[PDB]
Amino acid sequence: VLTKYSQPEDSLIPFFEITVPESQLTVSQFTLPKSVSDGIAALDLNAV
Amino acid sequence: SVKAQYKKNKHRHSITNPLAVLCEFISQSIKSFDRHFEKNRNNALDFVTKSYNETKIKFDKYKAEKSHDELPRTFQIPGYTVPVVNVEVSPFTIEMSAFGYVFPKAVSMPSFSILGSDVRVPSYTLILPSLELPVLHVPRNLKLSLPDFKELCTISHIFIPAMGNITYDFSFKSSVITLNTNAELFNQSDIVAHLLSSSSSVIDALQYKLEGTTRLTRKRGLKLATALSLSNKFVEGSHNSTVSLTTKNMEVSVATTTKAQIPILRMNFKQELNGNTKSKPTVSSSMEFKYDFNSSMLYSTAKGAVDHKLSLESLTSYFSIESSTKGDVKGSVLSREYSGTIASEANTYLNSKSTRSSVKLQGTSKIDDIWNLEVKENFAGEATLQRIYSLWEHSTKNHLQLEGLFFTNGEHTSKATLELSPWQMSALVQVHASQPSSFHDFPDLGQEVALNANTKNQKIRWKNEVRIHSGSFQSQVELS
Numbered sequence: 001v002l003t004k005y006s007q008p009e010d011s012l013i014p015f016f017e018i019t020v021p022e023s024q025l026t027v028s029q030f031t032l033p034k035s036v037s038d039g040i041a042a043l044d045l046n047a048v
Numbered sequence: 049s050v051k052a053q054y055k056k057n058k059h060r061h062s063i064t065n066p067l068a069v070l071c072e073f074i075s076q077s078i079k080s081f082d083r084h085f086e087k088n089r090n091n092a093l094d095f096v097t098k099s100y101n102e103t104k105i106k107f108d109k110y111k112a113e114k115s116h117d118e119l120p121r122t123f124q125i126p127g128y129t130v131p132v133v134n135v136e137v138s139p140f141t142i143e144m145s146a147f148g149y150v151f152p153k154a155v156s157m158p159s160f161s162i163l164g165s166d167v168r169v170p171s172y173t174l175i176l177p178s179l180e181l182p183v184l185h186v187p188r189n190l191k192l193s194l195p196d197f198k199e200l201c202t203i204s205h206i207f208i209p210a211m212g213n214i215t216y217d218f219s220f221k222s223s224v225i226t227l228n229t230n231a232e233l234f235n236q237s238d239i240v241a242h243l244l245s246s247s248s249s250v251i252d253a254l255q256y257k258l259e260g261t262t263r264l265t266r267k268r269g270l271k272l273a274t275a276l277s278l279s280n281k282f283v284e285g286s287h288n289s290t291v292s293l294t295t296k297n298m299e300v301s302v303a304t305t306t307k308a309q310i311p312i313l314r315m316n317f318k319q320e321l322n323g324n325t326k327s328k329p330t331v332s333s334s335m336e337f338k339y340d341f342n343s344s345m346l347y348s349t350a351k352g353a354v355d356h357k358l359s360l361e362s363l364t365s366y367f368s369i370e371s372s373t374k375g376d377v378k379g380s381v382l383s384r385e386y387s388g389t390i391a392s393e394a395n396t397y398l399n400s401k402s403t404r405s406s407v408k409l410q411g412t413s414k415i416d417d418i419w420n421l422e423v424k425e426n427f428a429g430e431a432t433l434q435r436i437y438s439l440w441e442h443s444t445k446n447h448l449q450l451e452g453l454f455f456t457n458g459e460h461t462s463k464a465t466l467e468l469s470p471w472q473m474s475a476l477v478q479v480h481a482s483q484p485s486s487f488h489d490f491p492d493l494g495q496e497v498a499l500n501a502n503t504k505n506q507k508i509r510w511k512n513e514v515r516i517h518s519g520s521f522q523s524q525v526e527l528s
Contacts, residue, residue: 010505032364041076047069 049219055212061237062205075196082193089188096177096186108182118146120153120180136161148179159195168197208266211235225249239264256280269293282309297326314340333358341379350386352377367398387420388413402432419447421458436468446483456485459493475499480512489517 001021007014033045107113121144128137137160143153154176159169172192177184214233220226226248234240241262249255257279264272270293278285288303304319318336334357341350354377359370375390391410397403409425422445429438445458459482467474480493491514498509508527514520 008503010502012504040080041073043073044069 051215051217051219053215057210057212059210061208061210063208064202065204065206066202067199067204068201071196071198071201078194078196082191085191086188089186089191092186093188096184100182100184103182103184113147113182120144120146121150134163145178145180151179152176153178165198165200165203167199168195170194208237209235210237225254238266252281269295284309299324312342316340328364329362331358331360331362333360335373347383348379348381350377350379352379352389369394369396369398381416384416386416402430404428404430416450418450421446434469437466439463439465444481453486455487456483458483471502473499473501484515489515491516 001018003016003018005014006017036043036045121142123142125140125142127139129135130137138158140157143155145151145153154174156173157169157171159171162169172194173190174192175187175190177186212235214231214235216231218227218229220228227246228248229243229245231243232241239262243258243260243262245258247254247256247258259279260274260276262272262274264270270291272289272291272293274289276285276287284307286303286305288301288305290299290301292299300321300323302319302321304321306317308315316338320332320334320336322332324330324332335355337354339350339352339354341348343349352375354373354375356371356373361368361370372393373390374392375388377386377388379386389410389412391408393408394405395408396405406428407426411422411425412420413422414420422443424443425441427439427441429440430436442461442463445460446456447458449455449457462478462481464477464479465474467476475497476499477497478495479497480495482491482493484490484492493515494511494513496509496511498507500507506527508525510525511523513522
């Protein structure tokens with residue numbers, strides 16, 4: 001995250017801009033009705 | 049002669065169904081609970097040592113213990129025997145330390161002896177510190193593990209009928225009509241059905257043939273395959289439905305094929321449905337319909353085709369939905385041509401980051417060369433996690449009247465768009481696209497709005513124009 005003292009073109013007031021850049025959140029692969037397990041109990045939907 | 053004979057068979061198959069997969073399943077949660085228990089102990093740990101800090105300096109050094117001591121609470125319950133349900137209850141011992149205030153002590157309870165497998169006795173051993181001594185230390189390692197519930201994990205007899213043949217024949221003799229309908233059903237292990245109806249008559253409409261097969265297995269999935277066929281001079285039906293369950297993947301195939309035999313109305317449709325699903329569910333739907341109208345008495349006819357195609361892709365990554373249909377029709381009514389058609393296309397893409405939706409519509413229809421040109425009924429909208437855009441309906445209307453003095457009519461809007469982004473807000477709206485005509489020069493309008501905002505930067509443009517008969521007015525407003 002950056003912080004910069006800037007002067008806008010369409011605003012005569014100088015400001016301080018704090019910018020958080022783009023983020024790429026990683027969502028790992030998961031399984032759907034084959035065998036689900038949420039860290040508590042392994043549930044085999046195919047078996048049922 | 050009516051036949052309704054029936055060979056009764058009370059015998060049935062008792063298929064054993066396992067439940068241990070469920071029995072271990074909740075037990076799996078228990079094991080997590082087991083470790084969760086020690087987590088609780090850790091929380092208790094965060095106090096126990098501190099509680100030790102509050103015991104010694106109060107009891108071990110200070111003279112505040114061993115004053116009028118009491119016998120520890122020990123409650124014993126002898127075992128019992130129940131021969132009716134055959135349950136043995138072992139003797140149970142409950143121990144509380146006398147020092148303190150009914151503080152819990154080490155409990156240990158084994159399992160009992162019952163008949164069958166209905167409930168499970170909570171056999172465990174929990175160890176807790178006693179206040180009779182200053183040393184208090186809950187064993188975090190020693191957890192509480194309950195035995196899994198054995199609720200008939202292997203005892204279950206699914207009942208399947210083992211039946212004979214359901215026999216029912218209907219036969220009748222006469223001199224002008226002859227019906228022989230036979231219905232039979234096979235229920236020994238699986239579902240096998242077939243119907244046969246034989247109709248014989250002098251009249252062609254009263255003489256036809258109806259037949260159909262129906263099969264459904266149970267040994268390897270519930271694979272169904274039912275096909276129908278009607279042999280009639282006026283109805284020609286061929287309905288084909290097959291559902292296959294190969295114990296791993298499902299299939300549906302619906303081949304519906306039937307046509308009409310009315311001389312004044314030749315209708316012919318078609319229906320096909322294949323709900324195939326192996327790795328990603330998908331829908332293949334296309335509906336077909338044709339019709340042919342002709343009325344000589346009313347001097348009217350109608351000839352068109354209506355179709356639709358449905359596409360659906362239930363893909364794990366994204367979900368795109370596709371739909372379009374056409375309502376084409378043509379006719380001639382009292383020496384006046386009839387037209388009209390519909391075109392649809394609703395494209396809606398969805399994603400966890402951006403979404404887009406555009407609806408394209410076509411309704412160009414005319415009533416005997418009158419009141420037509422209804423085109424461009426589209427509108428689009430896009431939503432992203434960086435920008436927003438919308439351009440709604442901006443159709444055009446230009447229609448002609450063939451009665452009077454060829455009156456022209458139709459009023460519509462131009463495009464009018466909205467653009468959104470940080471630091472940039474744009475509203476560009478051009479509207480009032482009218483059509484002047486006869487009868488003293490129908491008004492001609494028009495309106496332009498330009499809004500451009502970057503926080504403090506504000507550009508506002510507003511233009512209007514009005515035209516009436518032999519005069520006009522125009523106005524402009526500008527804010528910079």
